[PDB]
Amino acid sequence: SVITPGTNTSNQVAVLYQGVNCTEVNVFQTRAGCLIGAEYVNSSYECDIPIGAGICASYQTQSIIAYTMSLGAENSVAYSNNSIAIPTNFTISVTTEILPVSMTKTSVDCTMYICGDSTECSNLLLQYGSFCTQLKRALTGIAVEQDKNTQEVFAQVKQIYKTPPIKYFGGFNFSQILPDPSKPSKRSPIEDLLFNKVTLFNGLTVLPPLLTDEMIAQYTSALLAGTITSGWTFGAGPALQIPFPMQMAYRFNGIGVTQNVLYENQKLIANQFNSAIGKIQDSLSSTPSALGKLQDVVNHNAQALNTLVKQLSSKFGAISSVLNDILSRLDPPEAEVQIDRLITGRLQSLQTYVTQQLIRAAEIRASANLAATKMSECVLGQSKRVD
C-alpha cells in the first residue's frame, strides 16, 4: 500500500508491505506490516491516514510521521458525595444530517445488450431459456420500489398548507429556508445551494422519476408551513394555529425547562437561532465533503453503467469482440463455438450488474425507512429519544 499526503501538497510517499517483515522483504515494523518511508514519533495526535492496529500517519510540517492515535483529552470530572454542578446559561445550535432516499431507475434490454440485432445470435440465445424474463422482472421491481421510497418519505402530509404572507414570527428569521418567490424554481436558498453543490447506449436506459423535483419541493414547503404555524398538531389531525413564541414555549416544557425561561430571553434566543441558521449555509459551502453520501450514490450508479458498457469490448477468449468479424472469417460450425463464448460472457456480466443493484437497493431502502421515521418523529413532533 502507498501512503500519500496528496499530489498537490507534495510528491513524498511512504510504502506499506502488509503481511511481511522487512527482514524478509527509514524502516519500521508494525503489527500491520513493515512501513518504509516514515519515521515513528512518540507524540500522539488525532490521526487522519489510518494504517492499522492503532497506527496512523500524517504530514509532519516536511516529512511523513507515523504515530499512535490519541483518543481525545482526559477529563477527570470531580465526583463527590455532596456536590452538584448546574448550568446557568444555554446555547441553541443547528446540526445538518444528510440521508439518501433513492437511486436511478434503470431498465435493460436483453437481446440488444447481448448481441446487437444479429439474427444468428438471437437464434443461438433462444436456447438459454428465460434469463432475460427474470432479469427484466428484477429491475422492474427495483424501479417501483424507488418510487415507493420517495412517496413514503415525503408524502406524509395530506393537505398542502400555504405560508401566510406577513412573514413575521416573533424575531425568528426563516428566510433561509422558506421558498423564495423570486427565483422561478421556488426553492429556498439552502435548497439551491444543495442542488448546485452535487452533480453527476447499447440497450440500457434511465426511466425518469415520477414525483418531479418541483412536486417534491412543494411537499417540503407544505411541511414547513404546517410546522411553523401549527406545531405538532398538523400531524395528529386538524391543524390548529398557535403563535410561534408559544409553540417554542411548549417545546421548552418538553425538555424540562419552565417556559418563563423562554419569555424572559426571547430576544437572545431569537438572535442565537438566526445566527446559527446563517452559519449553516457557510458551513455547507466550505466543507469539501459535506455531501459525501448523495454524491456517492450518483457516482456509484454512473460507474456501474460505465463498466457494464465497457465490458462489451472484452473478447472472453473469442478471436474477436465484434460479432460481424467472427461471422465473416469462419465457417458456421466453428462460428457457433466462437459465439458461445461471447454470449455466455456478456450474460455473466449482465447478471453481475443485476445482483449488485439488488444489494444496493436493499441498502437504500433501509436508509429510506430511517429517513421516513426521522420525518415522522422529529418534524411532526418532538422526540425524547436521546441523540
Binding site: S1, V2, I3, T7, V13, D48, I49
Partner: protein, 284 residues
C-alpha cells in the same frame, strides 16, 4: 557513455482519435529516466548493435552526416537483409539480401554484392535539430515513427507520429547505421582513421513492454504520460487513472519473491538391464 533519457520516446500507438481523456496501454515503450548509449559522428567503422525488441534512435546534428540504416540477421547475402537510405531528394527502401562489406561504405555511392530484391519502396525524404525515430517489427510488419524538433536531450515532452508501416517479414536481429562525407575516400576495408566530419552524435535506447498512461488533450494530441512502473507514486496514479491523487492510502499491487532455482529429485534408481550381456556375449 551514458545519459538519462527524460520523458521522451512516447509515440501514438493506435491511430485512433481521442479527446480530453486518459488512456492506459500496454505496449513496447522506452522506460523513463533510463540511461541511453551515446556515440559520436567523427570517424570510426561503426559497431553492430543488436535489435532486441525495438530501437529508439535520436540524433542531434546539423550537417546530414547520418543518412540511413541497415537491418537483418547478417551483412552477408546469405539472408534477406534490409536497406534504408535517405538522400536530399527521397528515401529508397529495399529488401534484397545484398551482401555488404566488412564495414558499411562511407558515402563511391554504393558498396554491396548482387541483389535479389523482393520489395522496394520510395517516397519523400525524412528531412541543433533533434531528429527522433522508433523502429518496431513485431507482427510481420516493420514500423517507423518520427518527429523533428527545434531545440543534451531536452526536458520537454513530445510524442512520435506513425511514419510508415511496411509489409516485409524478414527476421531482423541486428542493425547498423550509415554515414557519409563530402569528398571522402572509399574502400571496402579501412582502419579507425576515418575521415573528418562535422560535429554530430547519435543515441540509442532499447524498448521494453510497459504500461503507459497517456493523456490526450481536446485536440487528440498526447501532452503527458506516466510510466506505470517507475516509482510508487506513478503506480498509484495508474490505478486511479488520474494525474492528481488525493490524501489517503491506496492498495496498488502485490509483490511475490520469485523462485531462484529449479530442482528435480528421483530415487537412487540403479538396476540397469543386461545390454552388456547380449553385446559382450561369449559365443554368438
Amino acid at each position: 557513455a551514458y545519459t538519462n533519457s527524460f520523458t521522451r520516446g512516447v509515440y501514438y500507438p493506435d491511430k485512433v482519435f481521442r479527446s480530453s481523456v486518459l488512456h492506459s496501454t500496454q505496449d513496447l515503450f522506452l522506460p523513463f529516466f533510463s540511461n541511453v548509449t551515446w556515440f559520436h559522428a567523427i570517424h570510426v567503422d561503426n559497431p553492430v548493435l543488436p535489435f532486441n525488441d525495438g530501437v529508439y534512435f535520436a540524433s542531434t546534428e546539423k550537417s546530414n552526416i547520418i543518412r540511413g540504416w541497415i537491418f537483418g540477421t547478417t551483412l552477408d547475402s546469405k539472408t534477406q537483409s534490409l536497406l534504408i537510405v535517405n538522400n536530399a531528394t527521397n528515401v529508397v527502401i529495399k529488401v534484397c539480401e545484398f551482401q555488404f562489406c566488412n564495414d558499411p561504405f562511407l558515402d563511391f555511392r554504393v558498396y554491396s554484392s548482387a541483389n535479389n530484391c523482393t520489395f522496394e519502396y520510395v517516397s519523400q525524404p525524412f528531412l541543433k535539430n533533434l531528429r527522433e525515430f522508433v523502429f518496431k517489427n513485431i507482427d510481420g510488419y516493420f514500423k517507423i515513427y518520427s518527429k523533428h524538433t527545434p531545440i543534451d536531450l531536452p526536458q520537454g515532452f513530445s510524442a512520435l507520429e506513425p511514419l510508415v508501416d511496411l509489409p516485409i517479414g524478414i527476421n531482423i536481429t541486428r542493425f547498423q547505421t550509415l554515414l557519409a562525407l563530402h569528398r571522402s575516400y572509399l574502400t571496402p576495408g579501412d582502419s579507425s582513421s576515418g575521415w573528418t566530419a562535422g560535429a554530430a552524435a547519435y543515441y540509442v535506447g532499447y524498448l521494453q513492454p510497459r504500461t503507459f498512461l497517456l493523456k490526450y488533450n481536446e485536440n487528440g494530441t498526447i501532452t503527458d504520460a506516466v510510466d506505470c512502473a517507475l516509482d510508487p507514486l506513478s503506480e498509484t496514479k495508474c490505478t486511479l487513472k488520474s494525474f492528481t491523487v488525493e490524501k489517503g492510502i491506496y492498495q496498488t499491487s502485490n509483490f511475490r519473491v520469485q523462485p531462484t532455482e529449479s530442482i528435480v529429485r528421483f530415487p537412487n534408481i540403479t538396476n540397469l538391464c543386461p545390454f552388456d550381456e547380449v553385446f559382450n556375449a561369449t559365443r554368438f
